[PDB]
Amino acid sequence: KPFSVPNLPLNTLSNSRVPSLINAMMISRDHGQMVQFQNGRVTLDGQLQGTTPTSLSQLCKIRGKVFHASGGNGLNLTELDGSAYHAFESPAPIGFPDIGDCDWHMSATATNNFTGSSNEYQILIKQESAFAPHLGHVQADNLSAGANTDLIVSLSWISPVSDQHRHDVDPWVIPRYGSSLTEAAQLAPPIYPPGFGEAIVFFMSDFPVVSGVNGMRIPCTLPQEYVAHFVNEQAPTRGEAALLHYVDPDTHRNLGEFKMYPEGFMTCVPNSSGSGPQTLPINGVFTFVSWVSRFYQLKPVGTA
Amino acid sequence: KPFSVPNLPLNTLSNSRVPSLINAMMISRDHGQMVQFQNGRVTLDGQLQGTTPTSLSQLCKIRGKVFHASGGNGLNLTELDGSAYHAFESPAPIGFPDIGDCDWHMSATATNNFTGSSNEYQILIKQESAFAPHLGHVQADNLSAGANTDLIVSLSWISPVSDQHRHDVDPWVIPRYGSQLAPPIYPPGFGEAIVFFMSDFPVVSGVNGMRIPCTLPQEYVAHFVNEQAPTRGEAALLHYVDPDTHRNLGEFKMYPEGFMTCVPNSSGSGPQTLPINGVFTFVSWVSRFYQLKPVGTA
Ligand SMILES: OC[C@H]1O[C@H](O[C@H]2[C@@H](O)[C@@H](CO)O[C@@H](O[C@H]3[C@H](O)[C@@H](O)[C@H](O)O[C@@H]3CO)[C@@H]2O)[C@H](O)[C@@H](O)[C@H]1O
């Protein structure tokens, strides 16, 4: 299989960290020096990493059996298909949200004999001591479902930590999957802008975020539909970087040069400390040009 | 350019009518006589039909500005990116849910200055006279948001119609958009049955319980829209293959209109007994005359 990227306009594709349409590209010197997102993580040759699903249907979802304990109610986690989650292996079940150091307001439904609004639960997952998805359990506040009830849970909105240790939401940080007790195993690796003057390209989507450092915006490193594409093709990586053009869909005019690294993320060079890809139209298409050296100097993108 | 289907296990893919993992395949001698789903509709050469999005991020969502009326408040619809929705182009905004003749229990959030639980609204959309998706407005009960508030709404669960004209939910039926639709699909003959990819979904009193049928995995839609492979025959012959063992588990024909058929053994359950972790693989272009080996138990 020759390497390719989807011929789909960027603004028809999803964020890989929340189920929301991409509406912007951005670079961030402050937040973009190192990222370790666990969702939207895949190699150019199709190797899934972290908690990354193939399908958006699994993204920002939790499944578990309800427990009632002295310390609070919560979920003994399963995979979304109900199959057993193997603790102390993956950071969390596949599709588990990777937005750290904030409150998750979520919606849960009974997977068995759903009768209506009494089988829908608005719950709050805090990232405190009892948040231990790597050990196979999280505590949920305002969870009234009976013990051993099987629940599928969707992320509704995120807000600053209940315990008031910070007053804003940083979507650039990932959860402590093993709580204070352990670093989680099989984390997708840290990513850094590799090349000369290069900045990691973040695909931005709007999401209900209370007091976001970037407002109601969530960054990711790859459109979700790109993940399914790479997992499908399993195309061999034949060079150090894939040179892409971001092209006008109608004229095929090259609007900018980007490098995709084997680690499954994309860089650009901004125009003399400009906003880089932020000023580009969002209806464009990425197109594979050739395999290039990691040293390949990208022509600056965007306005000065 | 050679036609292909995604080399991805079905159980890792989504329904194209609800955002839920595929957990079964089925045929139906009652429900599969005619289908006209508006989501999961695409040609094998990659032409989107009905309200079908490329991305699951657009599926089963509604966006609109709140209006207040004496008959009931509601939404003047936009597309999900917030751009204006025009009638006469499509049956409804892209990704508009296509589960007919039932109550839609939905969660709306403010797209501007989201403050928390006071900008999250649990609303009810009935399919009655004030349901006008084609015109670009729907009535919503239990909606307290201010006039002209921009809301993005997702489907939470479905239940029997409020006006009680029926006491079950049939997810095989599509909504009345007005008086543009992706065309009807029929079984083409010789015992060929339309394959339905089933996903679990909160459904109160479902005719098939808590199950939603579609004709394509969502990720197949994005694949065809990407590839745009010329259709070179009357049907794409597929093998449903164990990705480990590489063993052919059964034969299927995918038609240019973007649906699959199989032939059940002795009027049995057809693909229902097959494992759900298999992958479809393109074998060749065949004629309508190609007779599929029967699949399943009797
Ligand atoms: O502050 C971040 C949290 O905001 C929201 O929760 C807050 C909300 O539930 C209000 C409702 O009045 O209560 C807050 O707790 C207060 C409490 O009201 C005071 O009496 C007490 O002295 O202080 C506490 C904490 O400062 C509560 O924080 C969201 O729902 C949460 O997810 C957080 O984002």
Author numbering:
A (entry chain A): 230 to 533
B (entry chain B): 230 to 408, 415 to 533
What does the paper say about this structure?
NoV VP1 can be divided into two major domains: the N-terminal shell (S) domain and the C-terminal protruding (P) domain. In this study, we provided both phenotypic and structural evidence to show that huNoV DSV and VA115 recognize a group of glycans with terminal galactoses as ligands.
The results showed that two oligosaccharides (117 and 373) bound well to both DSV/VA115 P-GST fusion proteins with significantly higher binding signals compared with the remaining 583 oligosaccharides. Interestingly, only one oligosaccharide molecule bound in each asymmetric unit of the complex structures, since the remaining oligosaccharide binding pockets contain steric hindrance for oligosaccharides at crystal packing interface. The positions of the glycan binding pockets were located at the outermost surface of the P protein near the interface between the two P monomers, similar to the typical HBGA binding sites of other GI huNoVs. Similarly, mutations D332A and S388A of DSV resulted in loss of the glycan binding ability, while mutations H334A and Q393A of DSV reduced the binding affinity. Mutation P389A of DSV also retains nearly full glycan binding ability, since this residue interacts with the trisaccharide through the main chain carbonyl group.
